[PDB]
């Protein structure tokens, strides 16, 4: 935005009196392929988006009239046409980002969420005091529970709360980089976060690394990623402001030696929501979209039990399509829409995976 304005300094469109889609931040949200000069080329592409419509329909030549230089302008669309036109360059990797997710954006469950306060935030603020108290909290925790449900969003919540930029390392992200043997760079991302410290290193669905590779020639029967993760733990400590956060669907199958205490310590379980949490997370979705309270939010809570947050966040999201409001197919929000969605949405039909958690978690 501060680089683009330099090219707005090179345009007499005006800004801060003009506030509009052309506001440079809203357009800056689209692009990570680029850096400062690429934006210069971009505004030249946008500036060229203009000349290609303007100049040809004029059919100019050595004479250049002044009126054109006057009546001609640079619209918001040509930027979009310039933004949709892409030449991604900047290094292949995942970059730090600050989301807006917070306690306000997580309905969740206060009991398990409240533990995140003392698990992350407190160690962040007072690493020197626990020395005075004579305490050294863990190096990270491990989340396991029903798939989806927002377990990925739970870390994005503590991300904005920690006031530190956030990186999410997801299984597919390592695999695409793995083919290039860049796992050493995946480790560099952690050393990179340290140079950026404070920053949060989030290992997502780390059970997703092994399943595709079975047992093959990785480091040997144990993965090189595991070898990269073992070494990733060698560098960090409880001292650094960087926080390791595990999230896993199956925190067993791979190589529990790496999941062993001292590597990933706390075992935290994400339970599926309940009627009230189902209602709370529901209220968070419906408040943004227009609402006609023909539904009884407690009644559709009666119908709904055994539905995880994934089904709900999808159900809240899925029934929205069946309902139509502000266009002329419109049908308002009604139990009929949530009734038809009841058939479309898949319940939780496996209590197996649920009892493996409860039995294993209890004792």
């Amino acid at each position: 935005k501060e680089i683009l304005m330099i090219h707005t300094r090179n345009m007499p469109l005006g800004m801060s009196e003009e506030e509009k889609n052309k506001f440079l931040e809203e357009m800056a949200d689209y692009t990570y392929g680029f850096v400062g000069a690429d934006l210069a080329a971009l505004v030249r592409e946008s500036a060229m988006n203009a000349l290609r419509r303007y100049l040809p329909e004029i059919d100019l030549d050595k004479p250049i009239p002044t009126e054109i230089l006057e009546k001609m302008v640079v619209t918001e669309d040509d930027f979009k046409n310039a933004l949709k036109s892409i030449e991604p360059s900047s290094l292949r990797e995942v970059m730090v980002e600050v989301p807006n997710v917070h306690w306000d954006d997580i309905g969740g469950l206060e009991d398990v969420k409240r533990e995140i306060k003392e698990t992350v935030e407190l160690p962040l603020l007072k690493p020197d005091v626990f020395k005075r108290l004579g305490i050294r909290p863990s190096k990270g925790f491990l989340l396991y529970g029903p798939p989806g449900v927002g377990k990925t969003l739970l870390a994005k919540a503590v991300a904005t709360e920690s006031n530190a930029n956030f990186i999410s390392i997801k299984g597919p992200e390592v695999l695409s980089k793995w083919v290039g043997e860049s796992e050493k760079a995946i480790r560099e991302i952690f050393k990179k976060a340290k140079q950026v410290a404070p920053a949060i290193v989030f290992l997502d669905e780390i059970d997703s690394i092994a399943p595709r590779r079975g047992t093959t020639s990785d480091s040997g029967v144990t993965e090189r990623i595991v070898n990269q993760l073992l070494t990733s733990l060698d560098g960090i400590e409880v001292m650094n402001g960087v926080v390791v956060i595990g999230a896993t669907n199956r925190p067993d199958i791979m190589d529990p030696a790496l999941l062993r205490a001292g590597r990933f310590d706390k075992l935290i379980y994400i339970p599926p929501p309940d009627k009230e949490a189902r209602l709370s997370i529901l209220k968070v979705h419906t408040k943004n979209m227009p609402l006609a309270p023909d539904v009884d939010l407690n009644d559709i809570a009666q119908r709904t039990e055994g539905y995880v947050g994934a089904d709900l966040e999808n159900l809240c999201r899925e029934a929205g399509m069946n309902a139509y409001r502000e266009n002329p197919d419109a049908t308002s929000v009604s139990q009929k829409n949530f009734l038809d969605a009841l058939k479309t949405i898949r319940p939780s039909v496996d209590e197996e995976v649920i009892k493996f958690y409860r039995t294993l978690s209890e004792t």
């Binding site: 004579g134 305490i135 050294r136 090189r224 070898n227 070494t231 060698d234 030696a257 205490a261």
Partner: protein, 363 residues
């Protein structure tokens, strides 16, 4: 045997971690030898010409020919268990005003606060000590805490060992002090929970050659090359290893299996070639790999020559040692069945150890 008897005794590690720092426990029979009351203040003189004063207490399980002693004095003195010690009764000299400041290393010079009357006044009760000594006050909450290290620059009466009574004035400056004395984080045999039979058994193997090789090698036994540990790792393995090294006085050399595998041609062999190169000067020393099973699991069904060259490089380095400046390589794994038997023969580890798990007593 540990036998030394009479007013002159021999120093033996206390068989209990003890509540107090000044506790030196002696049996009724042992107490009758020096003719002193229980809890008496007795100044003990030892090798290196370093002295200290302690309280007597009792087990019923001791033998009069030893001394069950604190790790504070032994660390302050730097004593290796097995030294013949000279103890005698002396009347109490007492401080008037005492100045105390923590060591540089422990705090890093980042530490300041309150609690002069919380720590010292509560520790102000009945502590016999030598002037110019590092005195430790524990308490409060754990998991970041091993003792609290205060080094003595001055005691108002000077050039005298003194007991700390209730009439003395106390001071905490929180400014520089001598770091010569080790941090208790550097281990003591007390930090090993239980495993009394295994502690001595392993210790006598490495100790005697590391102490005086010129008989225990020459006129006795033969020095082994390395020792492997078994049972659940990461709990006592890394601690016991450094708990063997620090107390024996032999320098400790850290290795990481995953770091080697993280490396490749060059640095992989350079490191193993670099460490032993550094070991020659510090030799005799303690060399340790917690990860043995990770670097050399090979059962045939590994792949590369890089892993075979570095593990075979390890084979060469073992035999290349002279058993004169002899250094001891230590290893650890969860199970022996996994590791490679080609590492089990002479030329290298011929010596295997089985460490079990605690019990109601072990805990």
């Amino acid at each position: 045997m540990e036998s030394n008897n009479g007013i002159i005794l021999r120093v033996a590690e206390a068989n209990s971690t003890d509540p107090g720092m000044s506790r030196v426990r002696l049996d009724e029979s042992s107490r009758r030898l020096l003719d002193a009351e229980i809890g008496d203040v007795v100044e003990i003189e030892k090798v290196r010409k370093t002295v200290g004063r302690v309280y007597r207490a009792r087990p019923e399980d001791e033998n009069k020919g030893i001394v069950r002693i604190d790790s504070v004095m032994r660390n302050n003195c730097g004593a290796s268990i097995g030294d013949k010690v000279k103890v005698r009764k002396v009347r109490t000299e007492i401080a008037k005003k005492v100045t105390l400041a923590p060591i540089i290393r422990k705090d890093q010079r980042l530490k300041f606060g309150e609690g002069i009357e919380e720590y010292v006044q509560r520790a102000l009760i009945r502590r016999p000590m030598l002037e110019q000594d590092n005195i430790s006050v524990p308490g409060l909450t754990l998991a970041g805490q091993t003792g609290l290290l205060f080094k003595v620059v001055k005691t108002l009466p000077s050039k005298v060992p003194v007991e700390i009574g209730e009439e003395t004035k106390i001071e905490i400056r929180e400014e520089p002090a001598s770091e010569v004395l080790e941090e208790v984080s550097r281990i003591s045999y007390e930090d090993i929970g239980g495993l009394s039979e295994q502690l001595g058994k392993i210790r006598e193997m490495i100790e005697l050659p590391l102490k005086h090789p010129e008989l225990f090698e020459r006129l006795g036994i033969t020095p082994p090359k390395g020792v492997i540990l078994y049972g659940p790792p990461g709990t006592g393995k890394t601690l016991i290893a450094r708990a063997v090294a620090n107390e024996s006085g032999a320098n400790f050399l850290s290795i990481n299996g995953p770091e080697i595998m993280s490396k490749y041609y060059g640095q992989s062999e350079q490191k193993l070639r670099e460490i032993f190169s550094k070991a020659e000067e510090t030799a005799p020393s303690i060399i340790f790999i917690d990860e043995i099973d990770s670097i050399a699991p090979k059962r045939e069904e590994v792949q590369g020559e890089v892993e075979r060259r570095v593990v075979a490089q390890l084979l060469t380095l073992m035999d290349g040692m002279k058993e004169r400046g002899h250094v001891i390589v230590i290893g650890a794994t969860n199970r022996i069945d996994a590791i490679d038997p080609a590492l089990r023969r002479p030329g290298r580890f011929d010596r295997e150890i089985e460490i079990g798990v605690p019990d109601r007593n072990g805990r």
